[PDB]
Structure 1
Amino acid sequence: PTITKQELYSLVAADTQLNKALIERIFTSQQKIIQNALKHNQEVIIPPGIKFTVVTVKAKPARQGHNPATGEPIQIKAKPEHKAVKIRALKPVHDMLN
């Protein structure tokens, strides 16, 4: 399972009866549109209805974890504050199973 993006390019290119090079071409630009938008603190909604959003994640300190299998305490490095791209589904995405 788990159809990859390269398989998706081919899957779409075959259905539309078009070269896969154009398929990646159109998608590569869409990618740039998204990145440049989020870099300018915009919100974007893309097919099939996914909304892109810049958001702030508050810093999290360190805390030493433990591994059950290897039995060695494993420290996680404290994660400072940073921005993260948050996506969330919208109307047609859930409707896809109707």
Structure 2
Amino acid sequence: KPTITKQELYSLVAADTQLNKALIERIFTSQQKIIQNALKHNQEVIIPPGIKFTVVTVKAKPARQGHNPATGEPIQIKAKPEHKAVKIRALKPVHDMLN
């Protein structure tokens, strides 16, 4: 099929490695806790197959007022305060996967 789902990936890894799928799932899944905990402390993380997680600051977006052009009625956008966001970047092994 065009898309390998996470569950399909766990079965493929299980077959390739001759390991129980539950163990494979546990392993790839244990990464989430490490990554989320690290990013909450502004600690970056590199995971296989070569992806870097960082935290970036998103600048605040002020509130705006406008109008529906067809009806004339006012519309509003609330201010969006500055906040942290997760960024991921492919490292060289992923960038070069097609070679």
Taking structure 1 as the reference length, what is the TM-score of the superposition?
Answer: 0.79
Distance 1:14 1:73, change over 3 A: farther
Equivalent-residue separation in structure 2 for 1:51 and 1:45 (angstroms):
4
Aligned residue pairs, count: 98
Deviations 1:30-79 (A, max 9, x none): 11111111111111111111001011111224568999999999866543
Q: Residue 98 of structure 2: SS of its match in structure 1?
A: coil
Distance 1:95 1:61, change over 3 A: same
Equivalent-residue separation in structure 1 for 2:6 and 2:70 (angstroms):
34
Query: 1:65 aligns to what?
Result: 66
Distance 1:22 1:62, change over 3 A: same
Structure 2: which 5+ residue stretches go unaligned?
none
| Structure of higher CA gyration radius | 2
1:26 is aligned to 2:27: yes
Deviations 1:7-49 (A, max 9, x none): 1111211111111100111112111111111111111111111
* Percent identity (aligned): 100
Q: Which moved more, 1:35-44 or 1:64-73?
A: 64-73
Distance 1:68 1:34, change over 3 A: farther
Over aligned residues, Cα RMSD in angstroms? 3.2
Distance 1:74 1:22, change over 3 A: farther
Distance 1:18 1:55, change over 3 A: same
Distance 1:59 1:11, change over 3 A: same
